[PDB]
Amino acid sequence: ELKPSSAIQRGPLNKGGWDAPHALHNDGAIDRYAHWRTFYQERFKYTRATGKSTLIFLVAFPALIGYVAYQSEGLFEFAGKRRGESVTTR
């Protein structure tokens, strides 16, 4: 006995416009390939290869750049120069 009112006359929704003809034949193999590649993260897992890449590019490589950047900080002063003069500071 609880129904939305008899005074609605609600209809269908169109988006409106022109049916453009198909300029592309979709390939099922390429479509499911790309749908597998974009949503790759929902099925990614940790293996030995994944862990090796994550150990290098997230941990070891920022640490190597950190060693190089914080050690060689105010060494070089190549502004003028001469012969026999100090090229570094430390």
Added chain:
Amino acid sequence: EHQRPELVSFDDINYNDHKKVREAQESYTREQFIRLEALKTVRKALEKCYEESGPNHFEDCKNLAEQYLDMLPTHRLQGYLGYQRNDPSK
């Protein structure tokens, strides 16, 4: 009409009035461009010394070449925040 506004130091100008602070900033800045045009003028003279000398540029303007390599670390833009934020001898 080539206007010449006055020079205001940062020393004893009471950094609570924005008039003298901003003039001190602009004055240290504009004098720094003047300090640079000497570098840009000796470079223009050194190239004419070279192009007229030809082979004996090694001994004609050894003084201008060493002059240019002396000005080069110490005539460039350097910042008003280095001298405004810090005081020497304190």
